[PDB]
Design brief:
Three copies of one chain form a homotrimer. Chain A is built from one helix and eleven strands, in the order ββββββαβββββ. At the B-C interface, β6, α1 and β11 of B face β8 of C. The structure holds 2'-deoxyuridine 5'-alpha,beta-imido-triphosphate (3 copies) and magnesium ion (MG) (3 copies). The PDB classes it as hydrolase.
Chain lengths: 114, 114, 114
């Protein structure tokens, strides 16, 4: 790191999302509420796109919720995964794929930038 | 079934989502955590698109959470709805519209497919 | 009000979302489950677009969950924010930015509109 999103990989050619792994081992319990998991991946995103961070279905089904996150086109910070253990104690091992980044078109509008 | 996504219907012409129903009667309690509800609808999706499964607002407000799900362009499995009773006991009757499929453009990138 | 979405503002030029504030002071507890917060902003959306309502990351991290909401292209009602206190008591002050509206392309399909 810092590593750009061009280093992320897709599971398969037809996968919508780019996979995201935590760089740490983390244990989460329901009483902890939302935690921001480090990925060591950084924006910004390709021109005219923004990002959505979503959970992987297999991880959601194992009781780890990823709250959808919006990554702005010009965000240059670290992409973090906002996560919560739903019901039980969840253990995230270093390098496990926990979420996915989806890229979507950024529509321009005349909304004021105030 | 198997039924393709072309069999899904929109509530109205201007509806973003295609409605999804469970093919079973299911009761959900908060302690159960995430459950994958059968729809009997199968991918794949139209060329150059991927799917997002989201909750219907009326169903969310009645205490059933649908976790956002990504449906890859070339997924040929059954589209399932990942769902949780938030606070109370929720009963899903066979044929009730529980979620919606939204289609979005699949942006191509040079990310490796490893 | 009624106020149209053209009155919403972006945090910065590169922000994907248009910010949404509640027009009321609201306290939320976990046992309350989902609440629909008033914004005094109304659809409809620009041609060929639909909307997604998502949480702001800073608000999610402070324990207020926004359930993703789909806003249809031709929705002319009030845009409400579906929200839940995750673990703790959350207080929403009048005018605090609580969610964001993202605009996305509405793909046309031949799905029946029944
Ligand atoms: O899961 C997420 C969500 C957002 N982020 C980063 C990227 C995004 O561009 C940035 C700001 O996100 P939001 O607009 O959702 N957050 P907020 O409204 O609290 O911050 P700001 O006022 O800077 O826009 O936070 C993540 O790293 N992970
Ligand atoms: O709500 C959902 C989410 C995903 N799915 C299916 C369709 C999608 O293409 C497939 C894989 O989804 P994810 O990439 O989110 N899951 P995961 O990363 O666990 O599986 P894989 O390693 O196969 O990519 O699972 C559903 O049926 N419902
Ligand atoms: O967060 C949200 C979600 C939806 N809505 C409004 C806008 C949208 O067009 C409308 C209908 O949303 P859904 O299709 O998700 N709800 P549902 O399927 O329950 O209603 P309908 O049968 O009218 O389509 O509700 C909001 O105001 N906030
Ligand atoms: Mg995957
Ligand atoms: Mg609907
Ligand atoms: Mg913001």
């Amino acid at each position: 790191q810092k590593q750009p999103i061009s280093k992320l990989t897709r599971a398969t050619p037809g996968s919508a999302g780019l996979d995201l792994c935590s760089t740490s081992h983390t244990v989460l319990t329901p009483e902890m509420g939302p935690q921001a998991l480090s990925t060591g991946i950084y924006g910004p995103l390709p021109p005219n796109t923004f990002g959505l961070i979503l959970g992987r279905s297999s991880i959601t089904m194992k009781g780890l919720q990823v709250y959808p996150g919006v990554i702005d086109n010009d965000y240059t910070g670290e992409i973090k995964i906002m996560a919560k253990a739903v019901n039980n104690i969840v253990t995230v091992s270093q390098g496990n794929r926990i979420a996915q980044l989806i890229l979507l078109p950024l529509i321009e509008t005349d909304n004021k930038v105030q």
